[PDB]
Amino acid sequence: QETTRVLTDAAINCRSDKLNGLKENVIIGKLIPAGTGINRYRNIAVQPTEEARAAA
Amino acid sequence: CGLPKLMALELFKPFVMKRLVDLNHAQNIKSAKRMVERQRPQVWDVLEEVIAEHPVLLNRAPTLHRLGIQAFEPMLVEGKAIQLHPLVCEAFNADFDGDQMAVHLPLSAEAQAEARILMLSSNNILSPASGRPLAMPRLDMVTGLYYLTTEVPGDTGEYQPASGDHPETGVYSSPAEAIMAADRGVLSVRAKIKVRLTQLRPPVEIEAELFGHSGWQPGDAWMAETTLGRVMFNELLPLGYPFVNKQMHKKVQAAIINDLAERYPMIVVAQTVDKLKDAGFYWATRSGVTVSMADVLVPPRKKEILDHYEERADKVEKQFQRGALNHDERNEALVEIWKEATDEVGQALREHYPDDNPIITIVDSGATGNFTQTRTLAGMKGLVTNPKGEFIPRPVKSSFREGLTVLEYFINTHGARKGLADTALRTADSGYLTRRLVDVSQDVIVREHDCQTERGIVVELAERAPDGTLIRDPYIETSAYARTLGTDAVDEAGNVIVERGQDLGDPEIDALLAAGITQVKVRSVLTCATSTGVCATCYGRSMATGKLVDIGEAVGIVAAQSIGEPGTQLTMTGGLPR
């Protein structure tokens, strides 16, 4: 609402954004920080078990 | 879900092109593309091969809440219309009067895994809002199970114990023997018999009586006085579930599916719901619920009731004509008189009908409808509103069986058009409110597992009586259920019954009410202490699963959709502006 007014006083104060809400991450096409997007789940390392690695 | 094959050939065109290049049916993708466009008859087998185990998304606008998009596994279907499973219509809010649904398609491995695990149809049975099931039986199959499980006194083949010269002749050694005796024209389905069951778990009293510790019914034998129909119904349910022996009203089926969702895995609930759908349709056909105008019966003493209240209205109108009272007082007197007459006619119609009338069976079984629509069908319409909202003091003294007249139809049209415009305005306002709520609370997500605070709200939880008995508070299942206790629960300075950190399901609430305690201090998201979103123990059980909430859920959008979804049914400063 009032994209004129919101954008001009942000431009005066040199307001930096941090991209942490899930609204901004939709806009720039980045992965949203919810569900399968947070860092506990996005960096799972997957490897077969060493007992079953020698099975074939 | 079904799929028109002429559309599924268009969705899966690169997959089928790669597959019919890999099998030597074309030399490159160009001849493969022309082979797809000409629809040579090998492309159907290749299409089935690439369709198998690859989920699609289905979607009906408007997407009100979280269950508006649900994944499905496709399978090819002739014709040109999308076949939809008849139990997800309650979630989609879709009837078959010409509604259209969009089909999307996940592509990558992450998208396929998300659609296969998170968004599957059989994984989402319960509400995200309140926890009641959405895959419950409805309009037809509820009537089917009600007719299948009801009990008729004195039907054909009813068990009598009258033992003079001849024995009882109501017993049956097995449900297979009973099914044979009902296939031959002897046993009716709804007559009371005494079977000798060996495959269904008896209820708690008979189990503790006959076997005590664990009457494991896969081998055990026990007699039960039921109908054949309740045995045929209870065979749909799993083995470990006990016998029911009731009459399947819709609230009884709601309680059964809620108990099944609480104490069992999800796949058993999905298979039980499928079995209930099949039995409900198959017995809904044989139920004999038709509509004829010889089945819409009028109350016999309607006319004398109308004449008596007409004489009272005539005395009120004459008293106004004397000048003893103003316009508004005689309007109030006529409104009161005709409300009394409407309720009297409704009472006489309610007590006139039998129980096997289809128009009362469909209503009383909880399939659809209320009683006021049956009163307006046979009986009296009643007062009709004005365009503004005042009550026309005439009122309509006819019913749609008898047929209205010209002025009464012209009076009814006002309220009809006001209802239509109200519907349009209300759905627009509900959409705007959902947008505002999502726009506020989109950044409340679960971040930690336990914030480890000590503060918490307190719940009322079944205050007592002047006699002293703890009567159960009606608003417990919305307020106190699915919450984690912040402090312990002590009774009369005795033993601690339920410790800190427990889910507050059914049986511990029943145990607290049995011990006789009312106020409990429980944790909630108002008192959570994390800085970025809420913690998992403060949020409690997620209603959609039944287990604890996860460490990545977006509970804010779930809450905003659960508030803003039923706003269209808010039929009114007491409505959606309130």
Add this chain to the structure above:
Amino acid sequence: GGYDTPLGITNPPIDELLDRVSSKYALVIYAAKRARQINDYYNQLGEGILEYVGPLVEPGLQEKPLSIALREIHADLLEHTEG
């Protein structure tokens, strides 16, 4: 316990699959990364060999790699570490 046989996309049951992970999101990224590993094995069998091992359970006739990954997780043959 004994319930029924599953069929199609619901095999293996997720009620048994979630006894091997924490939440469903970890299960999703688990299965997706294992399926990407299996498909990277399949599309590099034509050239020289690499370390991309898999599959470990026996595949079907024409089975998607994601289903093989889910069956492998149900067979308790892999391991995973969160972040």
Add this chain to the structure above:
Amino acid sequence: DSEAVVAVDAVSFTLLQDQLQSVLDTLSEREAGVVRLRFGLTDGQPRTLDEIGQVYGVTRERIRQIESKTMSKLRHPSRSQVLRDYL
């Protein structure tokens, strides 16, 4: 936007380039070299018979004879049906 990328002709072009590389590899080294340097298949510059005979150390007429021999060699159904289906 009629001046956009159709996104099937691009992968068709890549597949055509791969099949062209395999078909030219079914010939000899010198034949593939003189065809690639004649038609600019590797850098995008069509050289002439003088430059091909310079890089191989022979007359322009020998290069022209080799080129006509290779063009007759490629004009076979067995060697060229897979390229015929690309047009």
Add this chain to the structure above:
Amino acid sequence: THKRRLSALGPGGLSRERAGLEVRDVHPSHYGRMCPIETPEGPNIGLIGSLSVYARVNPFGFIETPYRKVVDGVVSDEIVYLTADEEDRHVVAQANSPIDADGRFVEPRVLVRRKAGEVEYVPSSEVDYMDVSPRQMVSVATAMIPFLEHDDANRALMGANMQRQAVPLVRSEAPLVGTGMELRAAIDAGDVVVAEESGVIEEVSADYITVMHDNGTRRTYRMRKFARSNHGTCANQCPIVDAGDRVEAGQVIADGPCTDDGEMALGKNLLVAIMPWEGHNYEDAIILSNRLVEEDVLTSIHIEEHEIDARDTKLGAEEITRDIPNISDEVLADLDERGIVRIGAEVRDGDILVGKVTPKGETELTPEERLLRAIFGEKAREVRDTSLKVPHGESGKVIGIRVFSREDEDELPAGVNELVRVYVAQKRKISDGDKLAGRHGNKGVIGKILPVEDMPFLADGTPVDIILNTHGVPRRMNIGQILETHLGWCAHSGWKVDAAKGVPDWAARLPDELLEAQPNAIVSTPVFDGAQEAELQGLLSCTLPNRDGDVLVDADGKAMLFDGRSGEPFPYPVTVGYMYIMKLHHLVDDKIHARSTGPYSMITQQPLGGKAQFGGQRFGEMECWAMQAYGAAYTLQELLTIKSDDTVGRVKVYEAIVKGENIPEPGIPESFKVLLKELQSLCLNVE
């Protein structure tokens, strides 16, 4: 109904967003000047209405309404047209009032309408105006619903609205039970050729009728055969008069699209049971027999119109010919020597209709294309093919070809030398997904088309046609369809009451020559003065048998069906009868729609929208909310990056699917970079 339609929007009127809620309602002055039923039911309720039947417009622009004047209680015949103001000046009686066949009422306390729209019981001497009839307050399309006075207002709105979306069938059978408005509403609609003057028929044919008037002169009526309507339907006109017949003035001489023997006919008459059948008719779905597919009962023509034009360009001029580049001679066998197809050729989806080739110009050549042309010796072919191809999902024969040319000196826009139009027609059958409806708002798509054997047949082998559902009847308050069903069975089988001991008591007010009727006889119950319950019940009890002595339907209106699938009888009798249903213009072929990869937009890079193009579905805002609420972040990232805007990503995705590899990682969308360029363009250093 598109004429005589009263709106409040448009220039000089209020906007839709500025529409007050009070102007949508029905004022009590609308009685006889505007229908309180027929109106659109979208976000336009009450803003658009239709005129009444007996209404009339003043020279000033106000709306008149006739009224029977009555002096001293004796109802005269002097018809006086009143407006709203002098309607309010007087008091207005009721249409269906008991008049003594002498002008006077039988009770002093009559229903009446006061000044401010009130309803009273006046003594029968103050009454100075009566209505002319019933159905005065109703429109034309709403006056064609039998048993309107038993239906609720919403479902009568839906029925009167869906009664005009019906399509013209190929046989067009007249309804069994109707009102008396079909004949007038057909011969006033103008789609029926009426005999202008009385005379004798000289010659009929399929194309023209020539009559011979009483004095020498002849006139020929040219029919319209297979003319395209404005929405693709057909407009046939067939005669109904023989060679030697004699006609009168105003007599119908030729049927129209939806007419039978003079009157309106929008659908067919079909036997119907009201049982719920196996969940296939669950939640207003309809199942049908295969007899309607076999015997062309619900089939209609559809005519589509294609068009192409050979303009002039800078490099030359486009030409219409056969010499299409790089196209095999196998698909060039249909069209004739000058490029266009010939009349009668059946086309599939994607064939060549008009051969058209444009000049293109010169471009550089890639080395691989150069080498393939050197190998195969095919020439450059500098002209580009832009022919006319039939779009996706269409077929059918080719009726007509109309060609305009510059050399034949017709009027054309500037720079166009040849305009050619092709008319493709197809014969659409009925299918599952198509939408059917009755005359009472009981719509619903077709759920399944069963074979004729597994369909619940009657006691003597007759199978039923459609199967409705019970649960949609009582909670919508439209048992007018049940009364129509009972009276339809009576009108099909034919009745004969017994006047041996006089007329029975229920048929006392029943008029003469309805005491007996032949089978398949038509009747007409009017809108507000029609059948009664006692009349219909007593008429349903005496309903003479078919071929053998077998009264198939008992006194309640039901019958003992047989299950055609298992074999056993259904244990309870089921309501049967003859309904009248219509086929609607919501067919599946205009709705089924898919897209893998097609045309993209120009300004933005999103896929284009619409069924006319290939077209992609809008993945809107609330769908993004649902995908966030599930937690599925990867699917949302894919749906917003590599399926809409990642211009370097779409080709890589298609390549990865074709080659069989993993889908690569998505990049920055185009919309965000466009936003960045705009913010940099607006003197804002966005970094």
Add this chain to the structure above:
Amino acid sequence: NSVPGAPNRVSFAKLREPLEVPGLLDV
């Protein structure tokens, strides 16, 4: 009635209305 080539459609009406329907396109 009052239209010459009309099909005989027997009516259930009780009221004898005086005034026929006007010209439907006079507006």
Add this chain to the structure above:
Amino acid sequence: LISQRPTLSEDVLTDNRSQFVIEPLEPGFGYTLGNSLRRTLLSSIPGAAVTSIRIDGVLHEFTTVPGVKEDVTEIILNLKSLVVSSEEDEPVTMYLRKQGPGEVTAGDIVPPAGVTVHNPGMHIATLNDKGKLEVELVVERGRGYVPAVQNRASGAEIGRIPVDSIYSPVLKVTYKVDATRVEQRTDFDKLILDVETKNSISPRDALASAGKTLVELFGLARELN
């Protein structure tokens, strides 16, 4: 138990419909037996019907012939009502020429050797002084219902008009049972079956073909042991 195999008698009412009574039976069996016979009879009887016509002056389905009162689609809707019995499986052709005024009935169709038209009184179209009708037809065998097979599916010319086909000689079939089932356990069912055919084949031949189909299919579950 009882030891009495069921018999089948025949009862004629008119020339094209008759009655078949089977007795005795097992209790609770005549309904299923009659429904199985009806489901076979109503769908799987081989017959013959017209397949594609070709009028001389026309090129497609949506035109009019100069002279006739009806149009081409009405001629199609009338010719779909014919009943015709063939003898050999190759597609024979029959012609129809009629000149000048008069009503063109189905009796004017001249058949080749082998086929026959059974109702010559069927109206097709009517002509005037200037009218001329000339049409050839294609008769073919088969069973069941089949839609109009397209012209592209064959290799025919522009003049061919594919018509729908209904090779089904049966018209209306019902049954009823007479359950004695007295209180002495000498119980049986007496099924009365009714067949009506559209004068192409006799009801005995229709029931014989249905019985042959049932004897072929039900023996599949016998000798695979």
Add this chain to the structure above:
Amino acid sequence: MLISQRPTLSEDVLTDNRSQFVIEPLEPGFGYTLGNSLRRTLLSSIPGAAVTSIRIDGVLHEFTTVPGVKEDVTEIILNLKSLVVSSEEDEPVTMYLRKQGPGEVTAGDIVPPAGVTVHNPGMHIATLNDKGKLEVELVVERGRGYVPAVQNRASGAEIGRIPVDSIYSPVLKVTYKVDATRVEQRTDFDKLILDVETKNSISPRDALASAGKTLVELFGLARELNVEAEGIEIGPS
């Protein structure tokens, strides 16, 4: 004509006498035409024997308490009703079960005369409390299908003998369904799935074979009206 696709018949084996067959593919209406016919023919058309009337000494009118035993009279009645017994003589033969002294009666404690046989000797029937004596005379005959309690028309022996029902059919519970295999290449064909559970008198494959034989000899009547009528021939095996 020709069937254009020959159907098969394959048997799956569950627990020993609960086999489950499929028949695929069929012509698109032909599932239900033979499914219900096969269900009724498996049920009410196979011969077999069962108990018809018993008599217990000491019981005169009460039918409620037998002295010396633990279980009820009706419990003994339905325990005798669930007794599989095969005969070979088409006339009513009698049996006897004689046991005195405390203990538990089994079904193998009965003595079969010539021709009849019992197929579950380890079936529990009754228990004798202390110093009791059981002497029950059974009547075994054969027939078809299910049949209710034949009343005391022959009222001479009606004082001692009481009548029960008779499950003559060696099958118990037969259910079926259809399916929708190959909607595109075979254009919506049918797959009938049967499910039959018998007792241990006959295997369900042999029950299916006997039912198919009775069905084809039932439809031989309708076949033998015009032998030279064209049907739908399947072909050879």
